[PDB]
Amino acid sequence: LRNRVTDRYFRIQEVLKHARHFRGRKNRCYRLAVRTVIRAFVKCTKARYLKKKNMRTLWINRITAASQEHGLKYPALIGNLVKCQVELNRKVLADLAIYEPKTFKSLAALASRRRHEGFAAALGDGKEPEGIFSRVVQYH
Amino acid sequence: ISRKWEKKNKIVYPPQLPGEPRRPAEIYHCRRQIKYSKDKMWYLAKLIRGMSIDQALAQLEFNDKKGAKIIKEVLLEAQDMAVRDHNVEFRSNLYIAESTSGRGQCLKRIRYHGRGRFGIMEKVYCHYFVKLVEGPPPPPEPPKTAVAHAKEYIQQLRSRTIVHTL
Amino acid sequence: RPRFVSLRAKQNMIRRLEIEAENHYWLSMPYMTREQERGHAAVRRREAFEAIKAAATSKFPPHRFIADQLDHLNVTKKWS
Amino acid sequence: TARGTPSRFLASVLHNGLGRYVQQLQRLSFSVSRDGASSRGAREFVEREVIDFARRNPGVVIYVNSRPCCVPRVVAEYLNGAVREESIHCKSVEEISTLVQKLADQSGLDVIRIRKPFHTDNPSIQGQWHPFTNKPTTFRGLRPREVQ
Amino acid sequence: VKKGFRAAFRFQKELERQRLLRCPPPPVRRSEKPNWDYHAEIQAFGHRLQENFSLDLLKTAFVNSCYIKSEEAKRQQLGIEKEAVLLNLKSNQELSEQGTSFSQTCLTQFLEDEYPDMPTEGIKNLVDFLTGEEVVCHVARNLAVEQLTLSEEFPVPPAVLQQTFFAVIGALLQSSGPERTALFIRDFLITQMTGKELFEMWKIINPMGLLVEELKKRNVSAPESRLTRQSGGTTALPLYFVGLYCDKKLIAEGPGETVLVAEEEAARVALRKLYGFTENRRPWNY
Amino acid sequence: IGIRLTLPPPKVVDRWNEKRAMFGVYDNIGILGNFEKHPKELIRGPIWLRGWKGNELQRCIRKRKMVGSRMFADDLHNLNKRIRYLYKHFNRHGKFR
Amino acid sequence: RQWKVTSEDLILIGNELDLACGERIRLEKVLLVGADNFTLLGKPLLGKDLVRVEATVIEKTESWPRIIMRFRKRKNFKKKRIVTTPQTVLRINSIEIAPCL
RNA sequence: UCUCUUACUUUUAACCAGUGAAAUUGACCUGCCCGUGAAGAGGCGGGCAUAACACAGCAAGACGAGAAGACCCUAUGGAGCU
RNA sequence: ACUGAACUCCUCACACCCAAUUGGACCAAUCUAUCACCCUAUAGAAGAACUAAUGUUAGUAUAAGUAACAUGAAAACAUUCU
RNA sequence: CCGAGCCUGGUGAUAGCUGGUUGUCCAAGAUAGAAUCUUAGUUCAACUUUAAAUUUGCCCACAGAACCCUCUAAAUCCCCUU
RNA sequence: GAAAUUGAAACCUGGCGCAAUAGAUAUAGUACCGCAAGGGAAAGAUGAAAAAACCAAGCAUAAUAUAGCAAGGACUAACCCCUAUACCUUCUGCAUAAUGAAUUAACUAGAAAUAACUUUGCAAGGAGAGCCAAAGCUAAGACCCCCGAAACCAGACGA
Ligand SMILES: [Mg+2]
Ligand SMILES: [Mg+2]
Ligand SMILES: [Mg+2]
Ligand SMILES: [Mg+2]
Ligand SMILES: [Mg+2]
Ligand SMILES: [Mg+2]
Ligand SMILES: [Mg+2]
Ligand SMILES: [Mg+2]
Ligand SMILES: [Mg+2]
Ligand SMILES: [Mg+2]
Ligand SMILES: [Mg+2]
Ligand SMILES: [Mg+2]
Ligand SMILES: [Mg+2]
Ligand SMILES: [Mg+2]
Ligand SMILES: [Mg+2]
Ligand SMILES: [Mg+2]
Ligand SMILES: [Mg+2]
Ligand SMILES: [Mg+2]
Ligand SMILES: [Mg+2]
Ligand SMILES: [Mg+2]
Ligand SMILES: [Mg+2]
Ligand SMILES: [Mg+2]
Ligand SMILES: [Mg+2]
Ligand SMILES: [Mg+2]
Ligand SMILES: [Mg+2]
Ligand SMILES: [Mg+2]
Ligand SMILES: [Mg+2]
Ligand SMILES: [Mg+2]
Ligand SMILES: [Mg+2]
Ligand SMILES: [Mg+2]
Ligand SMILES: [Mg+2]
Ligand SMILES: [Mg+2]
């Protein structure tokens, strides 16, 4: 046996270290461990997409809850805030709902106010003055 | 083979200071190459795990298993050497701390089957290991009360945080 | 399993149809005729191909430097 | 993976940049061989770059050992008491200078998963939400379907 | 048996690590461990904190009385006491005393300026907290004071390390003057206050008593406790909010699992508002 | 576990023994010695391999030709079979044809 | 990313900022500034004169190693990559408001 | 034999003590209904169900296990016979 | 109106998601030359890397403490009885 | 273990058939056919890969590409400009 | 698959051989198996003197608690929540069908040419006789697996 692997222990250990926390023979038997570890790593890579997605649905759920406290629906809040030219993302709005409820009520008030301005503009077809909060800051 | 259990009685601790609680005496003893299954031996080892020396000897005396008398012999030897060599005050003032069976070196034989075919029979051997500690047997862990459960549950509720937020 | 057309699907289709209808309109009015168009970009188009040809023709092995060969002696550079 | 690894929250050592910023790196030990190809880059580093680094970072004590070794190493110690051992084996001067600067920039906190990309001790100014926020009070504090 | 060296060597290293993990060695001071030069270290200590120190004074700050006693005893035992007669190293008493005094005065000054409404007792307790063994040792550990300190025993006992830290304050006082040392206190000791509730720092008993005394001091009516909000009264998990009213005006509202706990909480809320240790108080200016 | 629990005894190599010190001497016997001798003449080994190189099959044919008659019976039989097998392999088997 | 920040708050930025440690910077682009009793929110940004937020670089680190793994069954398709992302930690020093309304 | 099966004894059995195999086994933290997958699902979807552990029965499922088949086809694969 | 991807934008980075096949950049360990001297460097070599062949040898599991196996009775252990 | 015993040798028989074919990373990369005791295979072409040389490639506009059968469409070929 | 023809240099005690599944089958053609010819193993490890630590699988320490390819995202928190149809190989294409795997350790599978390409040397010549040459010639580097039949023949051994 002119050449034979002397470092096989370490090669096994590289895979096995990731398998320690598994249950059953997967944690210790290399043949089984390697297969589960490949799956673990693949899942880990694909989970990044889901993490981002799940955070956003969580934020929307929380925003919905907080809006509903003020009698406003989720689409109403987000839509009207955008129309007020305020650009607050869903993460921050959810944070505000939890931690700054007075600020959130203010934002809910603003959204509601803008919503009524929209309805008044829609009802008042033709030549009518623009809503006070409806008017938009122009950038050039 | 390894024979570490024997070497455990060879440990010498430095002399204790006057302002120190008295160290309980520990005795390590084993029987090697018992012609008996380790799996069968396990039940008897488990039986006497928390017991005092006298309780254990009583239970073993009235047990019908082969391994019972072997453990009784080992326990008696351990009790004797505890008083003689390890400076235990009273032979009664001992309890089983550790009681274990391990595999022994085994022999392969042939078992003839009812054709040309056969099977490989294995002559089982086991080791019995015991550790005795000087002192009364420690009281068994009391069953969890309703108040303990209640407290634990409140603790769980109080521990919880707003997750995935600022 | 039978599949059915929702209101959303109809709305999505009409949205795309509206875009392509406008596309038709903007393709309706060309700035130049075909005769006026002829050979206007010819000079630029030519020069662009000569650029491609030049790149193709310029393929040759890189220069080999004496410094590169001698710098391998530094593998045994040591302190005194 | 995260489930296979320890985690921590984002933290500083002693509120580092609150009052004044204090460089966390304290000591830096280099093991270099006089002869040996592994430490070639390391030698060149010690020749040109280490003096200037020492001048730039007076708070850090630099030790250079210069002993026989197959692999040259840098050992970084931090104020919190963390020790990091980094191999500079068969590295160019540029690579070593990069690594050393990284060690200077780093704190002593473990490079593990950080649970939240933000940390605050005062998250709320207006008061954290509870069920009774956004709920109106009633006269005499009467529960629903209460006579008195 | 496989020919080769590298694999065997690597495995020896693994077993070494396993042995170390299984049986950790007793803590050893950094001075004893290699790559140590005391002079370089103390200079670096000075430079790290962006401050000019007298080298001699800072050296004196680190040396302790217990160390001097141990060194003397060791010299007596070795038998070279007469042979190696040397001038005794200056003790730690003077610098520590000066440092502790200045620290206390400046902490009181800072706390009084920032929080005028606070009583004397409260400011005293907050200064005590900031000068306590806990926080001072924590700061001392993370500023490498423990590494540089000369002590009889390792690890350094909290009392000794606290003393050493105040010695450093004293050395800086003598070197850079009061105003620089004040900035140092602000940058290290004051910052420990951050993210902490008042009563976490200042332990109180019977907050309702404190509140009634404080309100009678300001010549207002004694507070009236009322149930503002209530949920799940009969359950094992009730929530109660109680409010304190002075002449039918809300001063504080406090939540609790029981009414009594809620009362205590409301009282603590009231005291926080009176003394100006609200969560939403103006942050410290640095 | 197939790893040794002790370090192997350390290898001492005398880099300046006579064999290593005088290695390569007379390699230029021809060009510096009026071409009286070829460097190939300095090669010490089997009769059939002196200053010649070839693949396994070529080597076997050469061995059979040159020292075949002096070979042991069992060794000769093995060489015959080896040639026979290598013939079939090199002529009839492979990727490129 | 939008960061809800306060005084003495730490934030982790997933890039190198090309700033030396200890360097104080002003964060421009403030959307909303809130107190206990009032909030000012811009369209979409508040003016420079109105609000000033200051932070300092305290730490520049690599992230913990992130595994990228690709596997397709029965195709002999398996790839492994290890990535570490540069990171910066900012301490939000102060938020200040000037009377400009 | 059956209508139409019953009673008893022995063996086996089950329990206690001693000795102690074999086929088999990707890993299993190994449920039900309907659907999907040209049939066919413990594991996929929609519902439902669900503290956890022995011991004794059972043979509906795990295209249950071991060889040995029978059928059809193929090989410029064999062999016996004419 | 809103939700909704790895599409697109955003901060930073970029060789870093096809079967057979083909091209390229690295490289574990071993031996040799010369280094190096707590385990390495530049080269030259080669029995040079195994989650799979009802693979070979060895160890130990599962089924399983299962299937199965064994000593007529009393007694002074002289003996007698069935 | 006899439609032709067993052992050894020839023998590493032969097998267009079945099974297997061991570090890391990146890149390019898919379905016209012909012949064949041939359709389980091979050879040539087509497609694919690499390196090299040189100029056009693709997209295309006017013009242009059949009568007979009594009918016949979407289209296709060719093709400057772009 | 030739031959005529040409022409051959001579220093043994060495190894970029193996190191107990390797290298001989070999501790031995023994034990064992077969009537016979014939087939044919396995394994040992103290120290100068015996007149002297940790690591495979399997287990034990230490059984188990709704839920499901056994994980991943996570989380204050093991589980609860959300996401996720084992691996290899084969069939024109498909896997979820079929094939193979109890597990561990060790062993176990790409061998060479013409012609081209790359890098040197010399250059109308190259090559240490032969051979090639209308820029070639010389040298080097770089491409061609493993296991499995039923059979056929020769010589023995068997009523
Ligand atoms: Mg028989
Ligand atoms: Mg039964
Ligand atoms: Mg039994
Ligand atoms: Mg078996
Ligand atoms: Mg079904
Ligand atoms: Mg289902
Ligand atoms: Mg059962
Ligand atoms: Mg199944
Ligand atoms: Mg035939
Ligand atoms: Mg034939
Ligand atoms: Mg989205
Ligand atoms: Mg992305
Ligand atoms: Mg994209
Ligand atoms: Mg990219
Ligand atoms: Mg090999
Ligand atoms: Mg293996
Ligand atoms: Mg195998
Ligand atoms: Mg059973
Ligand atoms: Mg039975
Ligand atoms: Mg074959
Ligand atoms: Mg590609
Ligand atoms: Mg033909
Ligand atoms: Mg055919
Ligand atoms: Mg075929
Ligand atoms: Mg054209
Ligand atoms: Mg052998
Ligand atoms: Mg052998
Ligand atoms: Mg183990
Ligand atoms: Mg689930
Ligand atoms: Mg199988
Ligand atoms: Mg006869
Ligand atoms: Mg006869």
Swiss-Prot record, chain C:
<dbReference type="GO" id="GO:0005743">
    <property type="term" value="C:mitochondrial inner membrane"/>
</dbReference>
<keyword id="KW-0496">Mitochondrion</keyword>
<comment type="subunit">
    <text>Component of the mitochondrial large ribosomal subunit (mt-LSU). Mature mammalian 55S mitochondrial ribosomes consist of a small (28S) and a large (39S) subunit. The 28S small subunit contains a 12S ribosomal RNA (12S mt-rRNA) and 30 different proteins. The 39S large subunit contains a 16S rRNA (16S mt-rRNA), a copy of mitochondrial valine transfer RNA (mt-tRNA(Val)), which plays an integral structural role, and 52 different proteins.</text>
</comment>
<protein>
    <recommendedName>
        <fullName>Large ribosomal subunit protein mL63</fullName>
    </recommendedName>
</protein>
<dbReference type="GO" id="GO:0005739">
    <property type="term" value="C:mitochondrion"/>
</dbReference>
<dbReference type="GO" id="GO:0005761">
    <property type="term" value="C:mitochondrial ribosome"/>
</dbReference>
<comment type="similarity">
    <text>Belongs to the mitochondrion-specific ribosomal protein mL63 family.</text>
</comment>
<dbReference type="GO" id="GO:0005762">
    <property type="term" value="C:mitochondrial large ribosomal subunit"/>
</dbReference>
<keyword id="KW-0689">Ribosomal protein</keyword>
<dbReference type="GO" id="GO:0032543">
    <property type="term" value="P:mitochondrial translation"/>
</dbReference>
<keyword id="KW-0687">Ribonucleoprotein</keyword>
<dbReference type="GO" id="GO:0003735">
    <property type="term" value="F:structural constituent of ribosome"/>
</dbReference>
Curated annotation (Swiss-Prot), chain D:
<keyword id="KW-0496">Mitochondrion</keyword>
<keyword id="KW-0809">Transit peptide</keyword>
<comment type="subunit">
    <text>Component of the mitochondrial large ribosomal subunit (mt-LSU). Mature mammalian 55S mitochondrial ribosomes consist of a small (28S) and a large (39S) subunit. The 28S small subunit contains a 12S ribosomal RNA (12S mt-rRNA) and 30 different proteins. The 39S large subunit contains a 16S rRNA (16S mt-rRNA), a copy of mitochondrial valine transfer RNA (mt-tRNA(Val)), which plays an integral structural role, and 52 different proteins.</text>
</comment>
<dbReference type="GO" id="GO:0003723">
    <property type="term" value="F:RNA binding"/>
</dbReference>
<keyword id="KW-0687">Ribonucleoprotein</keyword>
<comment type="similarity">
    <text>Belongs to the mitochondrion-specific ribosomal protein mL43 family.</text>
</comment>
<dbReference type="GO" id="GO:0003735">
    <property type="term" value="F:structural constituent of ribosome"/>
</dbReference>
<dbReference type="GO" id="GO:0005739">
    <property type="term" value="C:mitochondrion"/>
</dbReference>
<dbReference type="GO" id="GO:0005743">
    <property type="term" value="C:mitochondrial inner membrane"/>
</dbReference>
<protein>
    <recommendedName>
        <fullName>Large ribosomal subunit protein mL43</fullName>
    </recommendedName>
</protein>
<dbReference type="GO" id="GO:0005761">
    <property type="term" value="C:mitochondrial ribosome"/>
</dbReference>
<dbReference type="GO" id="GO:0032543">
    <property type="term" value="P:mitochondrial translation"/>
</dbReference>
Swiss-Prot record, chain F:
<dbReference type="GO" id="GO:0006412">
    <property type="term" value="P:translation"/>
</dbReference>
<keyword id="KW-0809">Transit peptide</keyword>
<dbReference type="GO" id="GO:0005739">
    <property type="term" value="C:mitochondrion"/>
</dbReference>
<dbReference type="GO" id="GO:0005762">
    <property type="term" value="C:mitochondrial large ribosomal subunit"/>
</dbReference>
<dbReference type="GO" id="GO:0032543">
    <property type="term" value="P:mitochondrial translation"/>
</dbReference>
<dbReference type="GO" id="GO:0005761">
    <property type="term" value="C:mitochondrial ribosome"/>
</dbReference>
<dbReference type="GO" id="GO:0005743">
    <property type="term" value="C:mitochondrial inner membrane"/>
</dbReference>
<comment type="similarity">
    <text>Belongs to the mitochondrion-specific ribosomal protein mL51 family.</text>
</comment>
<keyword id="KW-0687">Ribonucleoprotein</keyword>
<keyword id="KW-0689">Ribosomal protein</keyword>
<protein>
    <recommendedName>
        <fullName>Large ribosomal subunit protein mL51</fullName>
    </recommendedName>
</protein>
<dbReference type="GO" id="GO:0003735">
    <property type="term" value="F:structural constituent of ribosome"/>
</dbReference>
Curated annotation (Swiss-Prot), chain G:
<protein>
    <recommendedName>
        <fullName>Large ribosomal subunit protein bL21m</fullName>
    </recommendedName>
</protein>
<comment type="subunit">
    <text>Component of the mitochondrial large ribosomal subunit (mt-LSU). Mature mammalian 55S mitochondrial ribosomes consist of a small (28S) and a large (39S) subunit. The 28S small subunit contains a 12S ribosomal RNA (12S mt-rRNA) and 30 different proteins. The 39S large subunit contains a 16S rRNA (16S mt-rRNA), a copy of mitochondrial valine transfer RNA (mt-tRNA(Val)), which plays an integral structural role, and 52 different proteins.</text>
</comment>
<comment type="similarity">
    <text>Belongs to the bacterial ribosomal protein bL21 family.</text>
</comment>
